Amino acid sequence: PLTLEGIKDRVLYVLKLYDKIDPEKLSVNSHFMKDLGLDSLDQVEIIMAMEDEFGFEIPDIDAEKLMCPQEIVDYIADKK
Amino acid sequence: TSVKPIFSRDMNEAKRRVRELYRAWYREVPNTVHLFQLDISVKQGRDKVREMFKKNAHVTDPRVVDLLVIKGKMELEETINVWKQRTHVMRFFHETEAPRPKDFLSKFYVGHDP
Amino acid sequence: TRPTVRPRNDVAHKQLSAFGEYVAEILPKYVQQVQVSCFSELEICIHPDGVIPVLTFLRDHSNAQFKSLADLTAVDIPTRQNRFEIVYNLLSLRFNSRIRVKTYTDELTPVESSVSVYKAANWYEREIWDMFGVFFANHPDLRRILTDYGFEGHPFRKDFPLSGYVELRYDDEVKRVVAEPVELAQEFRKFDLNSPWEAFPAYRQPPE
Amino acid sequence: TYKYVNLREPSMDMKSVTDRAAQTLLWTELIRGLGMTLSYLFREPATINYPFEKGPLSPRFRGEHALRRYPSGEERCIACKLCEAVCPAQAITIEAEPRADGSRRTTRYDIDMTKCIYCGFCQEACPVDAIVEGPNFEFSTETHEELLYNKEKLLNNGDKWEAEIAANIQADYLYR
Amino acid sequence: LHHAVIPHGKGGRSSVSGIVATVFGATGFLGRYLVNHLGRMGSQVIVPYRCEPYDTMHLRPMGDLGQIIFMDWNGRDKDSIRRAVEHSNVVINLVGREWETKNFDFEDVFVKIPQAIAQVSKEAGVEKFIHISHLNADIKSSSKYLRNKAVGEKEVRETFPEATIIKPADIFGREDRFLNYFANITVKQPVYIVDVTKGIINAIKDPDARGKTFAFVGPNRYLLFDLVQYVFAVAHWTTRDKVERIHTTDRTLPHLPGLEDLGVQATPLELKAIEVLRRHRTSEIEDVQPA
Amino acid sequence: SRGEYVVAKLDDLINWARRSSLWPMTFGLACCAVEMMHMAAPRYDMDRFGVVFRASPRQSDVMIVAGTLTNKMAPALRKVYDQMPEPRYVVSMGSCANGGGYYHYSYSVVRGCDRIVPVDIYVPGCPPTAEALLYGILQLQKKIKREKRLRIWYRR
Numbered sequence A: 001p002l003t004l005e006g007i008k009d010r011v012l013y014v015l016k017l018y019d020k021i022d023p024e025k026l027s028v029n030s031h032f033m034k035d036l037g038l039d040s041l042d043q044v045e046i047i048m049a050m051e052d053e054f055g056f057e058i059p060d061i062d063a064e065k066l067m068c069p070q071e072i073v074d075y076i077a078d079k080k
Numbered sequence B: 001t002s003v004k005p006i007f008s009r010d011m012n013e014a015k016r017r018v019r020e021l022y023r024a025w026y027r028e029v030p031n032t033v034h035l036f037q038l039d040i041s042v043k044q045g046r047d048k049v050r051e052m053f054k055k056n057a058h059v060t061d062p063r064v065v066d067l068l069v070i071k072g073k074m075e076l077e078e079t080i081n082v083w084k085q086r087t088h089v090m091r092f093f094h095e096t097e098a099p100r101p102k103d104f105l106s107k108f109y110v111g112h113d114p
Numbered sequence C: 001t002r003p004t005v006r007p008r009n010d011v012a013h014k015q016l017s018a019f020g021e022y023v024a025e026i027l028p029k030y031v032q033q034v035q036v037s038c039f040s041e042l043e044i045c046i047h048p049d050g051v052i053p054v055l056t057f058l059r060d061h062s063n064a065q066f067k068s069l070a071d072l073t074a075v076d077i078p079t080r081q082n083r084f085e086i087v088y089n090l091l092s093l094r095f096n097s098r099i100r101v102k103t104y105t106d107e108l109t110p111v112e113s114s115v116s117v118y119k120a121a122n123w124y125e126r127e128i129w130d131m132f133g134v135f136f137a138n139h140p141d142l143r144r145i146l147t148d149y150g151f152e153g154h155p156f157r158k159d160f161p162l163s164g165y166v167e168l169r170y171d172d173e174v175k176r177v178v179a180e181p182v183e184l185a186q187e188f189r190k191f192d193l194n195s196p197w198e199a200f201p202a203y204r205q206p207p208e
Numbered sequence D: 001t002y003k004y005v006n007l008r009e010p011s012m013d014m015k016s017v018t019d020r021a022a023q024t025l026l027w028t029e030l031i032r033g034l035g036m037t038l039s040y041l042f043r044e045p046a047t048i049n050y051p052f053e054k055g056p057l058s059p060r061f062r063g064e065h066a067l068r069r070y071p072s073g074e075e076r077c078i079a080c081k082l083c084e085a086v087c088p089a090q091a092i093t094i095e096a097e098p099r100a101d102g103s104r105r106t107t108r109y110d111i112d113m114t115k116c117i118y119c120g121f122c123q124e125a126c127p128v129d130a131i132v133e134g135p136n137f138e139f140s141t142e143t144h145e146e147l148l149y150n151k152e153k154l155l156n157n158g159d160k161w162e163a164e165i166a167a168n169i170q171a172d173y174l175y176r
Numbered sequence E: 001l002h003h004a005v006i007p008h009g010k011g012g013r014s015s016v017s018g019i020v021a022t023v024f025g026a027t028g029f030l031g032r033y034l035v036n037h038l039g040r041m042g043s044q045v046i047v048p049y050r051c052e053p054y055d056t057m058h059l060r061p062m063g064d065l066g067q068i069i070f071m072d073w074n075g076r077d078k079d080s081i082r083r084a085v086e087h088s089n090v091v092i093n094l095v096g097r098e099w100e101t102k103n104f105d106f107e108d109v110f111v112k113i114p115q116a117i118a119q120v121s122k123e124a125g126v127e128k129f130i131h132i133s134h135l136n137a138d139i140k141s142s143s144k145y146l147r148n149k150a151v152g153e154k155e156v157r158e159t160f161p162e163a164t165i166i167k168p169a170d171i172f173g174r175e176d177r178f179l180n181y182f183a184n185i186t187v188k189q190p191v192y193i194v195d196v197t198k199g200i201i202n203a204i205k206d207p208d209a210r211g212k213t214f215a216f217v218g219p220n221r222y223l224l225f226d227l228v229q230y231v232f233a234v235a236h237w238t239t240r241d242k243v244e245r246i247h248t249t250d251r252t253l254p255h256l257p258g259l260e261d262l263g264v265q266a267t268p269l270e271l272k273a274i275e276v277l278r279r280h281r282t283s284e285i286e287d288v289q290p291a
Numbered sequence F: 001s002r003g004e005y006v007v008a009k010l011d012d013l014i015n016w017a018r019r020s021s022l023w024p025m026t027f028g029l030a031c032c033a034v035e036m037m038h039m040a041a042p043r044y045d046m047d048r049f050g051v052v053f054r055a056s057p058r059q060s061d062v063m064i065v066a067g068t069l070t071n072k073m074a075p076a077l078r079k080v081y082d083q084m085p086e087p088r089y090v091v092s093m094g095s096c097a098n099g100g101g102y103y104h105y106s107y108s109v110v111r112g113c114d115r116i117v118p119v120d121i122y123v124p125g126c127p128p129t130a131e132a133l134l135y136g137i138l139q140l141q142k143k144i145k146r147e148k149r150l151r152i153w154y155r156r
């Protein structure tokens, strides 16, 4: 049951549920820092928000080196 | 000349430690603001927390950012215990106006405020 | 010069002089000054590296015990590149003699957990850290003693004024204790009692 | 010389151990303590009725903060500011105009009884012995307004007695 | 003008502001919080109390050292009133009880008292005479309280006509009447206390807003029953003359400005109810919003 | 006016009852605490008056602030003061407490306890005489003689 596409979907709608990104403006290979206007403060907020929702331990160098939603889901698939 | 470094080697581990410290303040706010029963939304508390991190963003030294890591670490420990009471946690805010806008004219009416 | 004048006793001056020369010989590495005052207590002025070897030597060594620890304050002066002074104070239980180990530091260079060699130094170290901000490295537990928690600013510095910046009262709007910018009712009339003509000509510094 | 305590053991003589066991099993020295406190029961109590018998003092007690004056004369203060110069809590506020007739005087001579630590440094320092600590200690003030004295309060306080301070200064022009 | 009516420096706690407020009553609720905002401004509150010294003791250290002053008064004499307003800058009129007594009722307080004090204030030379009134107090029926306050509005417009008639809504605060009435057991717009008293102090220190009557608006304006739902969702003297007063009239009056025209930002009911509604034991925020 | 005569004597009775016992709690930080425990000594009895020392804040009558009140102390002070029964009366003892005093110009000294609690009786001294503190308690009791609470409730 705990499969790859459902993990993609749940990361997708918790990114939807997060409110500080205006608009939705959805991109999986985004590099959303520069292109979609996210500071690294919001970056650590989102990464440990995933950690709080259903994530692994998720240490801080892994928290910085993702920067990208499909790459985030690929990190979860790199462990889960 | 050179300096014995405190904790870090360049600005990078300083940014990593402050990142982790901000994660710790993030997981510090909601349980403690339930426990002390304040009157402030979790959004408002967290946003003034990240405002306080926005206050000191322009610091260009590893030593001072390490010392601020020590500051935030001590303050986070003594707020995650039950020592710092309701008075001090509310004293982090400003419920004493102080409404003064930065208008030249509004500072000019009640004056001697250059 | 005899009546109503505290007499010197230069035999003790000579004994502590010989001990200071002994210390400067046996530890050649971290010694800049070994001075003796005329009221005969030893002062040893120290580069901030070998403080832990100095204390592990001068706690022991069977020629000079010095188990007794006392005051530590990093007495803050400006005008030097190294502002602060860690002033350790020591007394031997066996010998009745007081030495002072004064090492220098500036606003960022630490010392390196001196609590592990003198167990009395724990709240002394935490005190100097809280009141000044002189960080002490690799100490087990640093917290805040002798200040308020919400207070900050390291008040024993010279830049901190005589009053503060926050001031408490009780407001009835939100029904709690709040803080304000400090608003005096009297001036604290500061006096300039620095009258000239050099009451001590023994200490005349030279000009340019 | 060192005269130290408790280097002795209860010796194992049979009478020693039965007397200590009788102390244990029969509570004897406890009853001796009872007898001690009953000996203080039957004493006469060392109290004083306050509002009819006030407690003893000295001639050198430090009290009231009055201003004096000359024998049927002017204000003994000159506004020479020594009392502010040595007042440690700095409760003395002096502002000194000269009066109409050319002689130097005051405008405002204020003590904060809230702030004053009652040393008598102003007593040791007033060069003419104008401001003198009084005898009595009865203020009990309902307001925080009243505890800021002014010159007319101090002069009326000096008007409320002189013969007391006359006897005290006659008792203390010899030591101080 | 003469000095010391100029302000100096910052505001509050021996930071001298330039107004001298003779405040009537104020040993109750709204006058007490207004005294607190004036001490936070650092002003001189001249308050007459007619009571035991203990209640004015519990409001006493609100202002600074000697900036407050206490004195006796009564609702019958005149010499005490003139002795009160000997040297006054401004004066605010806040007196009135929600229940009848033996010696004093709803009548002749709202009919006697503002006439006499407005008369002697117009004589003794004050400015900015601010008189309070209830919201929508008219000659509408079944409300002796509302018709007496409407006659009071007419009389304050009558004598000293350059008076600030104000009309705040049904206030809720820390010591609310009707909320605590709900604790022991038709739209409606209640408005929180600090919005009202900030509007009062801003209207008293921002002149050119003088002589024109002002009205306050609760920033919800929904049904009474949904508010009962919310207050019992968060919380887990009973005369029905009060219940006619709280059932009778609830409307807006657009004939005059309000909050944001004055320089004061509103705060809704929900956050302040989270503040004051303690006492769960020893959140269901509905807010259905009817129009 | 037999009702008013009954109100006068009944107000007399309850004011006598309030001023009679008055068992305090000693807050007592610095050397003014030593002076309070010296006016509980044999040479000055509070117990002649029925005034009995008691560390129970749920039955305290007069709160005597005495000592150097600080910022780090003050929230604990008003948390003590809040859970005291509504008949409460405050004696500020000592120049530290009735206006800051000797440690006036520093950080972490509230300039007298006026900024924290309302104060009924200021008594000065650094330290006050024990005898003077007893006199201050007498003038507080005369304030309790002057209450007219029941008259105000009769004609409110």
Ligand SMILES: NC(=O)C1=CN([C@@H]2O[C@H](COP(=O)(O)OP(=O)(O)OC[C@H]3O[C@@H](n4cnc5c(N)ncnc54)[C@H](OP(=O)(O)O)[C@@H]3O)[C@@H](O)[C@H]2O)C=CC1
Binding pocket: E025, E026, E027, E028, E029, E030, E031, E050, E051, E074, E075, E093, E094, E095, E096, E097, E098, E104, E109, E132, E133, E134, E168, E169, E170, E171, F156
């Ligand atoms: N819905 C409402 O009722 C609202 C009312 N207001 C207004 O707020 C004002 C203050 O009332 P509030 O804070 O609610 O509480 P209070 O009713 O306690 O305030 C009224 C004050 O006037 C005094 N007073 C009452 N009757 C007399 C009298 N006959 N003689 C002398 N003094 C008298 C009161 O008693 P004492 O002298 O014993 O102190 C009190 O100090 C009132 O004028 C009221 O109109 C404002 C908004 C809403």
Ligand code: SF4
Binding pocket: D076, D077, D078, D079, D080, D081, D082, D083, D084, D094, D125, D126, D127, D128, D129, D130, D131
């Ligand atoms: S020392 Fe004496 S004479 Fe001088 S100013 Fe003070 S009171 Fe006056």
Ligand code: SF4
Binding pocket: D083, D086, D087, D088, D089, D090, D091, D092, D111, D115, D116, D117, D118, D119, D120, D121, D122, D123
């Ligand atoms: S007794 Fe001491 S504190 Fe008081 S006025 Fe004199 S010098 Fe100042």
Ligand code: SF4
Binding pocket: F030, F031, F032, F033, F066, F067, F068, F093, F094, F095, F096, F097, F101, F102, F125, F126, F127, F128
């Ligand atoms: S007023 Fe004086 S005696 Fe009392 S606590 Fe302060 S320093 Fe001690």
